[PDB]
Amino acid sequence: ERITAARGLELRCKGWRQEALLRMLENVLENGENQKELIVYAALAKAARNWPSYHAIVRTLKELEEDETLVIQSGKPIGIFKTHRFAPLIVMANCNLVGRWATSENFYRLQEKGLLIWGGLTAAAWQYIGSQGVIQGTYEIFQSIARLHFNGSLAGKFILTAGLGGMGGAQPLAGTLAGAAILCVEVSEDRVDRRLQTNYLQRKTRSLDEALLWIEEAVDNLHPVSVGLTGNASDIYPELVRRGITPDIVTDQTSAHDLVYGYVPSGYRVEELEEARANDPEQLQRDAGASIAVEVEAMLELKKRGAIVFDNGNNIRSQAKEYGVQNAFDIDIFTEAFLRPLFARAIGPFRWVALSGELSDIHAIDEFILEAFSDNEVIANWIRLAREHVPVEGLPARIGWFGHGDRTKLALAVNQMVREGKLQGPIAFSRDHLDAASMTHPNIMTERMKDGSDAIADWPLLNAMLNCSSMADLVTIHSGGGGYAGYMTSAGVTLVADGSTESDIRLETTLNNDTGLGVLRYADAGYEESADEVRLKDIRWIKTN
Amino acid sequence: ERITAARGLELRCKGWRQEALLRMLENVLENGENQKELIVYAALAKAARNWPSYHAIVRTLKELEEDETLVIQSGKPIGIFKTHRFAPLIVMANCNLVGRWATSENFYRLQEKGLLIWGGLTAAAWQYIGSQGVIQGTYEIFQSIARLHFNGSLAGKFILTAGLGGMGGAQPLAGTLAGAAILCVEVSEDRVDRRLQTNYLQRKTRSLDEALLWIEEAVDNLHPVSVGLTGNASDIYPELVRRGITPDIVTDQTSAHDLVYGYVPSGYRVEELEEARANDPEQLQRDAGASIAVEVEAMLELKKRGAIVFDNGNNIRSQAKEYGVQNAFDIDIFTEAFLRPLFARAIGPFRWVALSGELSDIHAIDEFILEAFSDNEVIANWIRLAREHVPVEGLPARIGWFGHGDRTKLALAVNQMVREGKLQGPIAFSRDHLDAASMTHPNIMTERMKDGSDAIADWPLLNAMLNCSSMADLVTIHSGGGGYAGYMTSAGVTLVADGSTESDIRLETTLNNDTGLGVLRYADAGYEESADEVRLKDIRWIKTN
Ligand SMILES: NC(=O)c1ccc[n+]([C@@H]2O[C@H](COP(=O)([O-])OP(=O)(O)OC[C@H]3O[C@@H](n4cnc5c(N)ncnc54)[C@H](O)[C@@H]3O)[C@@H](O)[C@H]2O)c1
Ligand SMILES: NC(=O)c1ccc[n+]([C@@H]2O[C@H](COP(=O)([O-])OP(=O)(O)OC[C@H]3O[C@@H](n4cnc5c(N)ncnc54)[C@H](O)[C@@H]3O)[C@@H](O)[C@H]2O)c1
Ligand SMILES: O=C(O)/C=C/c1c[nH]cn1
Ligand SMILES: O=C(O)/C=C/c1c[nH]cn1
Questions:
Q1: Of all protein residues, whose CA lies closest to atom 1 belonging to ligand 3?
Q2: In whole angstroms, how far apart are CA B196 and each of A24, A123, A321, B129, B201?
Q3: What domain range is B316 assigned to?
């Protein structure tokens, strides 16, 4: 029987802050792409190191007092420590390796030995809310491209992408919300069907000709459509190049970061991957890397024929370069090219979860946002769209990109709504780690920083320490695993709006500092949007020169 | 005019917790090996990124309120954030680079660009107390060797080492406190004289024959002696091999971790190093690496002739291997070979500083320890020796290795002594980062862990987050710079015992968790001393299997 988050108002823990974390753990497994292996998303991002660790985490949370801290180490609960009730209930650090040892080869060996797990960004910290977590980011990428290259509209524009997994599955809905005709190549029919049946996906086919006919009809009419094509991206993309078909936009969101558990090489059936991992994992990686190289060569050709081509944050260019595509980094990254003006003001992927399990709670917050942020036409547009079109996945939840001060405003209003019984139960707040002071990754978040600080990992470490100092409920530091090993370090944070007045202080303190450090990180690198935000919001940026 | 720590009881800041950190900053510069370059020790471990950063840190500390946190990033003050008064006053993260970019070459380039500094372990967190900080560790190494190989006594035993810098300068006194005849090779006459005049060193010479005559007379009589020999270790060590002279113990504590600013190659004069760094830094590194290789070859030969040979934590074996010494790691590391049974109980380099500047404060704490820990003959022996023989360096301070619960006991007694006026002024507590949950370094602290977890850097990240959650005054996360780039990540903590009852809670909470996580880190790796300590001290170690 599949794990699901507890619904309703019956506490299993000593309080609602503890219960919230337990339900978020259950919720990432409920929305997980392979719950049975503790895998939440991204092929091998796990919620805990193993089932023994999971059960001991669950036991510990049920007995944890508000003035204690549980320490979790690469997904394994280690000990319980006395702190105080304005300190995190959990601090965790997942898959951190000292630099010269931070290689994929070392990662697999240590995971085999039982010593670590990769936590993804939001898997091991239990902050994943389903595909919705990434859908506004992708939609904002598509809209930024529209503004930059297509007069503000993707109507009649053709997007090609691949991957309909935990995160990739958001792309068809992001595409059609932006008015685009979007073709998503996916190797697993199982995944195609899942997205069809949750209505992230409109149409499916096994025929490329049929898919292109549908795309053509939509483009010609300026209608949106999403098509899932069963196939391998390293076969389909070169074929479009052969046919001289250049989409207007091309990206990829396959699991290219991991050549053992992620990217399916050309000529392999999904059914034989386990077999291949067991017998000859080395050949499988070589085959996956060669197929990624073919796919990116096709992307590069599409780029030269005029497509807007970009990396959607999966190290696909890094992999392609390793397997011989020397100009792979001619392809843009979505951060530097499209979203960095948002990050520079610490506008980022803020999210919240209705721990009661009641969708009416999300809808009440939706209505609050439309009323209280009505001068913010971006968030107002997004919330209208999400309320109408994003289905419930696990616990009702909402993604909503907010910047400095706005996160705090929302969370304080919601906490009061919990306190006043306008919401049925407490609300958990969190975010992706793809946020201003909380991620360092030279080929994703921090590629080509203005000051060259691409590799500086101080910032997420600072974000974690400051958030611990700011009364958050859960704080985490992650580093890359699998093919992300050695590429990134990030930090996450969870807050529980349980209605109490003491939570008001925690929410205010953490959220102002979580975004505040984000603004200063980009201000330090010389971004003028950040310097403007500092003045607008009276952030205390220290001047030295 | 040289920077010195303020003495006396006049506050320059808004409170004594803030003043304590300001004085510790001044104090590491006062005891610094090259204050003029902000360099505290270890060739390039700096207290701040640059003088502009230093002045802005000083200004900020003078105005910082107890409910605020200053964020420092690789030695540069970034911003001031509202937290609460049971949160750190400072969180800092120094010289952290994502793994694939954590190389010495990247480090130098980024330091050149003005983007980072190496913080050492205790330099950028202002936790260095002078040479005393390391002297008990070295003495415990020598005593462990004595127990293992020489019937409990180094009387009549010959120790050969090199390096009389910030940390290396402790070796002659550690040697003679243990009864040994110790020869210290040092290239700079300036350094030799400094140690002579602070009485860390008994005798100096420029003649190897004279040095060996002195060593021989002492050995023969079972007397202790310390001799500083002006010379290059890569010349002297092979010469002893040539002469068939095998000391009983051989180590090195030169700055072998950095081939640009540290290790002086054979045939270079110290006077020309600056010139060489400017013109041809690449040749200088090659020359330094070749000379380290020669020195370690000599060490390896001495080992085969029966010397107890070990690496004293300066990556000398790593460097030697890189420059061709394939069996360099046949030489023991002091952690795994001698001190790990202490680390396994979180016994570690705890230290405290009399912020009043009054030596009588240290002496009162000394007397307290002798009375309150009298069943602990190890600490009782050490304190007697240190009070008698360790000179004051900068602010009066004391090193004293204590384990779980004992650190807390000491700090609570001292805080009460501050409160009751038995001490003139507040006391700062800290430690080296060479401590149980606070250091990851596969070729120093965590070489050859029982469970193979040598590379896992989760633990210092956890130590920092938990200490932030535990009401510490300053928390830091550092990673390696120079030749340490990619090798290590560590965490430090500072507490201010200012006498208040609220500080009692902070000191208790932080110290129990700083050592408590340390015990659990070694317990997790399977060390039986740790499992014993857990039971003895009722540490809440979670069981999963
Ligand atoms: N680290 C970041 O900053 C960041 C941010 C957002 C997304 N992501 C990345 O998004 C990528 C995907 O995330 P996920 O959660 O969707 O992964 P997931 O593994 O759940 O799904 C990956 C999908 O790709 C399919 N696939 C694999 N090889 C294929 C091929 N050759 N052709 C077609 N389809 C193929 C798989 O069948 C699966 O459905 C990952 O690399 C994740 O890291 C990363
Ligand atoms: N990272 C750890 O875990 C740890 C712990 C303790 C000590 N240490 C290391 O101890 C080593 C020294 O620390 P420090 O603070 O003494 O450095 P320091 O640079 O102040 O002094 C180094 C001394 O070595 C001398 N020297 C350089 N090359 C020489 C040569 N070829 N022959 C003789 N003398 C030579 C220099 O003149 C200087 O006096 C460093 O590598 C530091 O990291 C490291
Ligand atoms: O939105 C999430 O939960 C995760 C986003 C992400 C991207 N890459 C890894 N995790
Ligand atoms: O005792 C100190 O202050 C520093 C010890 C240390 C060892 N290596 C780097 N710092």
A1: A133
A2: 63, 58, 57, 19, 5
A3: 131-338
Same domain assignment for residues A384 and A505: yes
Asked if B197 and B153 sit in the same domain, the reply is yes
Look at residues B338, B356, B372 and tell me which one is the last residue of a structural domain.
B338
Q: How many residues does chain B have?
A: 545
A120 and A232 in one domain? no
Residues A161, A105, single domain; the answer is no
Nearest CA to A482 out of A319, A350, A373 is that of: A319
The reply to whether A91 and A152 lie within a common domain is no
Q: Any long-range contacts for A64-71 (C-beta under 8 Å, 24+ apart)?
A: A64/A13, A64/A14, A64/A18, A64/A89, A65/A14, A66/A14, A66/A15, A66/A17, A66/A18, A69/B466, A69/B469, A69/B513, A70/B542, A71/B462, A71/B466, A71/B517, A71/B520
To the nearest whole Å, the CA of A456 is away from the closest chain B CA by 5
Which stretches within B207-255 are classed as H helix?
208-221, 233-242
Give the mutation candidate from B94, B100, B439, B545 for the A interface (greatest A CB count, under 10 A): B100
Closest by Cα among B424, B427, B429, B416 to B358: B424
Rg (chain B; Cα; Å): 22
**Domain endpoint, select from A338, A369, A397:** A338
Q: Would the CB atoms of B96 and A540 count as touching at under 8 Å?
A: no
What is the C-alpha to C-alpha distance for residues B249 and A272, in angstroms, rounded to an integer? Answer: 59
**Backbone dihedral region of B470: left (phi > 0), alpha (psi from -120 to 50 degrees) or beta?**
alpha
Which residue among B71, B465, B486 places its CB closest to the CB of A517? B71
Q: Determine which residue's CA is closest to atom 5 belonging to ligand 1.
A: A313
Residue A475: list chain B partners with CB under 8 A.
465
Q: Is the CB of A492 under 6 A from ligand 3?
A: no
β-strands A540-541, B76-82 pairing:
antiparallel
Question: Domains in chain A: how many in total?
Answer: 2
Comparing CA positions, the residue from A39, A77, A41 lying closest to residue A56 is: A77
* Structure method: X-ray
Dist CA B229 CA B187 (whole Å) = 8
Q: How far apart are CA B525 and CA B135, in angstroms?
A: 28
The reply to whether B402 and B282 lie within a common domain is no
Spatial distance between the Cα atoms of A344 and A326, rounded to a whole number of angstroms:
30
CB neighbour list of residue A149: distance below 8 Å, 6 or more residues apart: A308
Q: Whose CA is nearest to atom 15 of ligand 1?
A: A42
SS3 B212: helix
* Inter-residue contact B265 to B277 (CB < 8 Å): no
The two tokens of residue A18 are 């503890």
- Which of A167, A75, A161 shows the shortest CA–CA distance to A130? A167
SS (H, E, C) A38-96: CEEECCCEECCCCHHHHHHHHHHHHHCCCCEEEEEECCEEEEEEECCCCCCCEEEEECC
SS3 state at B309: strand
Whether residue B47 sits in one domain with residue B70: yes
Q: How far apart, in whole angstroms, are the C-alpha atoms of residue B56 and residue B36?
A: 17
Query: Which residue, chain included where needed, has tokens 């190494």?
Result: B141
Sheet holding A332-333: strands in order across? A203-205, A225-230, A181-186, A158-162, A249-250, A308-311, A332-333
Q: Are residues A395 and A424 in the same domain?
A: yes
Q: Ligand 2 pocket, B266 CB below 6 A?
A: no
A-chain CB neighbours of B106 within 8 Å are 455
For ligand 1, is residue A224 a contact (CB within 6 Å)? no
Amino acid identity at A182: I
Do the Cβ atoms of A255 and A43 come closer than 8 Å? yes
As given in the structure block, the two tokens for residue B82 are: 């509202």
| End-to-end CA gap in chain A | 62
